[PDB]
Amino acid sequence: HGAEELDPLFDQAVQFVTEKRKASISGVQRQFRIGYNRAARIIEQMEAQGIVSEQGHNGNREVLAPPPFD
């Protein structure tokens, strides 16, 4: 499956967090122009896929998945 469960911007968000080596709900909000809930959703799924780690700071998610190209 894919979009069925993942967010329409998930793929872009993964590349965004991977390319930036950083996953943030606020970052994706402004970069993807999506409501906070959506950002946290995409990042949430990222945690489900293994792209992001457990949150430690304030809204800061760790990116464990590398970029699509490099």
Side-chain angles (χ1 to χ4, degrees), residues 15-68:
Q15 180 191 295
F16 167 33
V17 300
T18 56
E19 279 207 311
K20 287 249 189 214
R21 304 295 298 160
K22 278 259 287 137
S24 40
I25 311 183
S26 180
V28 192
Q29 271 156 286
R30 273 288 284 196
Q31 225 82 289
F32 290 50
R33 309 281 285 198
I34 50 174
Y36 175 79
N37 65 94
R38 219 230 238 287
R41 231 206 132 160
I42 306 183
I43 282 158
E44 258 250 328
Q45 281 136 342
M46 276 198 254
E47 193 194 24
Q49 322 230 328
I51 315 185
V52 297
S53 212
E54 289 218 324
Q55 274 194 42
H57 224 172
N58 57 93
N60 288 266
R61 262 237 196 280
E62 189 144 312
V63 186
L64 321 142

Side-chain angles (χ1 to χ4, degrees), residues 2-22:
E4 292 265 317
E5 13 190 38
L6 273 190
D7 186 293
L9 292 165
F10 190 95
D11 293 67
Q12 316 210 133
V14 187
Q15 180 191 295
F16 167 33
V17 300
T18 56
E19 279 207 311
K20 287 249 189 214
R21 304 295 298 160
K22 278 259 287 137

